[PDB]
Amino acid sequence: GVTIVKPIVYGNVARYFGKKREEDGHTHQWTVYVKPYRNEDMSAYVKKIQFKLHESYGNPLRVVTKPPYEITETGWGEFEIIIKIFFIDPNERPVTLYHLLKLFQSDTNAMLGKKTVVSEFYDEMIFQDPT
Amino acid sequence: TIVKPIVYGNVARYFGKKREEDGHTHQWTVYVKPYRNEDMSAYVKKIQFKLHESYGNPLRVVTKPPYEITETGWGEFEIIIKIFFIDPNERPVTLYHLLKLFQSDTNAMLGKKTVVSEFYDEMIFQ
Amino acid sequence: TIVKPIVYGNVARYFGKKREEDGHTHQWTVYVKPYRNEDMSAYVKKIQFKLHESYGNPLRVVTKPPYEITETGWGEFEIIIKIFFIDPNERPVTLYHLLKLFQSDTNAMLGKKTVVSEFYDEMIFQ
Amino acid sequence: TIVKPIVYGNVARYFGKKREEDGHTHQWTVYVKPYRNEDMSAYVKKIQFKLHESYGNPLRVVTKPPYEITETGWGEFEIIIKIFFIDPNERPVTLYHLLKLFQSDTNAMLGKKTVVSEFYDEMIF
Ligand SMILES: O=C(Nc1ccc(C(=O)N2CC(c3nccs3)C2)s1)[C@@H]1CCCN1
Ligand SMILES: O=C(Nc1ccc(C(=O)N2CC(c3nccs3)C2)s1)[C@@H]1CCCN1
Ligand SMILES: O=C(Nc1ccc(C(=O)N2CC(c3nccs3)C2)s1)[C@@H]1CCCN1
Ligand SMILES: O=C(Nc1ccc(C(=O)N2CC(c3nccs3)C2)s1)[C@@H]1CCCN1
């Protein structure tokens, strides 16, 4: 048996509209995502990835079966999103991730003039494959 | 069986007004890049960007990264992207992209100074 | 006992003119962040930022990320950073940072608009 | 077997003009980092960064974290990264990195302040 490491990145990006939107009061557009770090086809071993949004969103249990594993929405506030990665192999248990959706730019990055809020974290999906 | 994810599309920026010399209103850059950072020149020989016949030398080509073509113009048209590979037995990949210049009704004043129209795809090998 | 690498420091920006009300000339933000991004709040209870005694409320506390404190002033002084951990059986980690406001004769003479001064360190706890 | 994932590469930033003293245009930082927020100095003795032979002391050696080398210049060139281990019976790992300085037209129009070229690898024990 060999140890197999699949490095991934996950989190969300966000952009401020500049003001409140008149129709719904939304202020940001954001995209929560899960990506492989390397330029590889993650669908070779991932069956699906579900993003559990806040209950106020329509169909809050989002399911992405085809890459890219990204969900783009709008809103005005920050809430926790549960990410669960399901694998094709039935012996490989799913990975559950927790991400606080970040909309508001930190003071440090605002002074640095960064144009996009980026809240990205890392994970090492570890597998044990027979040789 | 090796799958290489890519994204393709264009970015564009409005001049603010029409340019008097040629009537152009936007500068745009059509591009192809990997979904995640990698040396795509290890397996891509060159990428052709077939512009509208109005442009001089409409069949542009880029032989090394970054695979991008920057131009100006006044309207939206279809660009044909043809990706050639170092492996002489790998058939080229042809993509079609509609150049986006004008912001939609959504991102009209939503702080987007540069419009983006980008799409995910996958190149499959052997 | 685990070692968690961190980066601490500050960014600063000149107003462009001395503020007449209080003579302040710069806005700055002192911060602590992990070397590689991670949820520091999983093991950090709070971080205290002790400013110069002349400030109003010189002792600031941050309990949730981003662990940053923004203020204004006219000079460079030493800030004491105390990092408290969740496990109550843990002495805090004390960092010392000299706030940097003024652009050097070469480190930012290329026309830069923001000053940055940060350093690497490690937290040995638990 | 123990697997230690790492990332390596460089970040670059344009000066805004060309420095008249030496013709340099960019500042860059070549580095090696752990993938997660760990302490590599528990098993890493030193990391060598072999710059182009024109630089002064081109064989830069970093014996304590962070494993970064910041310099300036005007062109892109290959850097050889060699990672030495505390265990004397572990063979060093050699990495090759092409320094990236120049920003693409796409990222320039997007207003990105920084050029990044970073890659993933693993050290197996
Ligand atoms: O903000 C917070 N929770 C949020 C949950 C949903 C938010 C949002 O922005 N939404 C756009 C939207 C609509 N879809 C259709 C009509 S409305 C739902 S915010 C908290 C509480 C303490 C601090 N953070
Ligand atoms: O816009 C559209 N077709 C366009 C084709 C070329 C366009 C452009 O921007 N051009 C600058 C220019 C030159 N470059 C060098 C000499 S001329 C040509 S536009 C359509 C049809 C109706 C709405 N969409
Ligand atoms: O400058 C220096 N120490 C500084 C201490 C406090 C500074 C500051 O900027 N502020 C306090 C504050 C106030 N606003 C109203 C009343 S107090 C804004 S500076 C040194 C000593 C030698 C050279 N560097
Ligand atoms: O550019 C290239 N190779 C380079 C090697 C070192 C470079 C550099 O920028 N610097 C050395 C240094 C000095 N300043 C004064 C004395 S030494 C600053 S460039 C080529 C040709 C096309 C791509 N590869």
Q: How far is CA C37 from CA A46, B82, C94, in A?
A: 24, 38, 21
Ligand 2 site, residue B75, Cβ cutoff 6 A = yes
User: Choosing among A107, A112, A122, which should be mutated to test the C contact, i.e. which has the most C CBs within 10 A?
Assistant: A107
Asked if C touches B (at least 3 Cβ pairs < 8 angstroms), the answer reads: no
Q: What's the A17 CA to ligand 1 centre distance in angstroms?
A: 16
The 3-state DSSP class for residue B101 equals coil
Residue D17 main-chain phi, psi, to 5 deg: -160, 180
Chain CA centroid to CA D106, Å:
24
Q: How many CB atoms lie within 10 A of CB A40?
A: 19
Single-letter amino acid code for the residue at A127: F
- Interface check for D86 against chain B (CB to CB < 8 A): the answer is no
Taking CA atoms only, the protein residue closest to ligand 3 atom 1 is C75
Which of these, B32, B25, B109, B31, lies nearest to B75 by C-alpha position? B25
DSSP state of B75: S
Give the Cα separation of A124 and D38 in Å (integer).
13
Q: Do A3 and D5 touch (CB under 8 A)?
A: no
Q: Do A111 and C13 touch (CB under 8 A)?
A: yes
Give the Cα separation of B59 and C84 in Å (integer).
62
Q: Strand B26-34 relative to strand B2-14: parallel, antiparallel, unpaired?
A: antiparallel
Q: How far B33 CA sits from the closest chain A CA (Å)?
A: 11
Give the Cα separation of A89 and A86 in Å (integer).
9
Ligand 3 site, residue C74, Cβ cutoff 6 A = yes
Give the Cα separation of C106 and C115 in Å (integer).
12
Contact, A25 vs D25, CB < 8 A? no
Residue C25, token pair as written in the block: 């000339």
Geometric angle at alpha carbon B62, from B56 and D113, rounded to 5°: 105
Ligand 1 site, residue A79, Cβ cutoff 6 A = yes
Give the Cα separation of D2 and D123 in Å (integer).
8
Chain CA centroid to CA C79, Å:
7
Q: Do A124 and D35 touch (CB under 8 A)?
A: yes
Query: Looking at the partner chain, which of A3, A7, A115 has a beta carbon nearest the beta carbon of D120?
Result: A7
To test ligand 1's pocket by mutation, which of A27, A72, A79, A82 has the most ligand atoms within 8 angstroms of CB?
A: A79
State the SS3 of D10-57.
EEEEECCCCCCCCCCCEEEEEEEEECCCCCHHHCEEEEEEECCCCCCC
Residue of chain A whose Cα is closest to the Cα of D2: A3
Asked if B touches D (at least 3 Cβ pairs < 8 angstroms), the answer reads: yes
Query: Looking at the partner chain, which of B3, B36, B109 has a beta carbon nearest the beta carbon of A37?
Result: B36
Ligand 2 site, residue B73, Cβ cutoff 6 A = yes
Ligand 2 site, residue B111, Cβ cutoff 6 A = no
Single-letter amino acid code for the residue at C110: L
Q: How far C34 CA sits from the closest chain A CA (Å)?
A: 11
Residue of chain A whose Cα is closest to the Cα of D124: A3
By what technique were these coordinates determined?
Answer: X-ray
Ligand 1 site, residue A77, Cβ cutoff 6 A = yes
Give the Cα separation of A6 and A38 in Å (integer).
9
Single-letter amino acid code for the residue at C15: F
Residue of chain A whose Cα is closest to the Cα of D4: A5
Q: Do B68 and D119 touch (CB under 8 A)?
A: no
Residue A14 main-chain phi, psi, to 5 deg: -150, 155
Single-letter amino acid code for the residue at D14: Y
- Interface check for A108 against chain C (CB to CB < 8 A): the answer is yes
Strand order in the sheet with D93-98: D59-62, D44-50, D78-85, D93-98
Give the Cα separation of B43 and B88 in Å (integer).
10
Counting as contact any 3 or more CB pairs under 8 A, the partners of A are B, C, D
State the SS3 of chain C.
CEEEEEEEEEEEEECCCCCCCCCCCEEEEEEEEECCCCCHHHCEEEEEEECCCCCCCCEEEECCCCEEEEEEECCCCEEEEEEEECCCCCCCEEEEEECCCCCCCCCCCCCCCCEEEEEEEEEEEC
Residue C122, token pair as written in the block: 């490690």
Atom of ligand 3 nearest to the CA of C74: 9
Taking CA atoms only, the protein residue closest to ligand 3 atom 18 is C73
Chain CA centroid to CA B48, Å:
10
